[PDB]
Symmetry: none
Subunit: 94 residues, 4 copies
């Protein structure tokens, strides 16, 4: 049950909602497929990321959405799942 | 040579300008210090990252700003722990 | 100005993508928000002619399925031997 | 939302203790075309607004009489205490 992650249904989706999650150690995600409508969730960033080097992570994981367990599979959609290391840097003259 | 990086002087600030650099494999930077005016520059992301493992990088590197070589020193780069980052994922129900 | 008409792609094969690029098009994908990912096709020259304006990287509108979807350019894939945009990612805002 | 930012004139242990005494925490403002500046912000004033999405959209730091539009870039909370140790703000 190590591949079992708690998912929180997102309330805010406007400006700064994603940045808010990041500073709270989270990141936004979308759960879809089937007859049920898509559900926007928030997952623990470092907890999810630490499993993304395991082959079975891309096979099947479990998201606990509001108590109910939901089996999902990550989709290869975005070109680069991992984002740039450096966003800004300061340099001092020596 | 290895610690020699091309620095393009930024002319466009404001909203969207930083994302534009990111989509071109670059990131915004500021060169300050001494008793001269600060200058906004753009650097190649991977070129810098591929040198951030070497101790010399944190001692002294050279930035080519407008054709002239400027000896600078990176500031507070090691402040935050560096980890793989994700800002979005897609999951399908199985 | 920053509003572009998008065509939903139903054929997602490698062949279909090249057939787009062969006629002023290029494949793109839209994801994020509270909706499932959507594969679309955009007019090449129309998009490219606006990628010099910094507000293109601020916020643009894609008309998908008769609906206006506010997105940001998330990724840009360019040709190795040509000045053509091969593929793009757009994230919803 | 506007927050009062005081440009720090002293650094170190004693300087930090005086900030923790005035109900303030150390913060850094960088980005744009200006040098990074170390500032001091009211702890409770900032923390009580970090539950609003507007705080992460755009806030204004009043630095030296100048209104500086910024975004909260990074945050450091205590190891087990419900308070903020340090924050980073990027200029927008």
């Amino acid at each position: 049950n190590a591949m079992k992650f708690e998912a929180v249904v997102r309330t805010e989706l406007g400006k700064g909602a994603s940045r808010r999650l990041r500073l709270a150690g989270q990141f936004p995600a979308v759960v879809y497929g089937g007859e049920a409508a898509p559900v926007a969730v928030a997952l623990n960033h470092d907890d999810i990321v630490n499993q993304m080097d395991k082959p079975e992570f891309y096979e099947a994981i479990t998201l606990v959405i509001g108590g109910e367990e939901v089996k999902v599979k990550p989709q290869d959609v975005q070109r680069h799942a991992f984002k740039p290391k450096v966003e800004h840097m300061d340099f001092i003259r020596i």
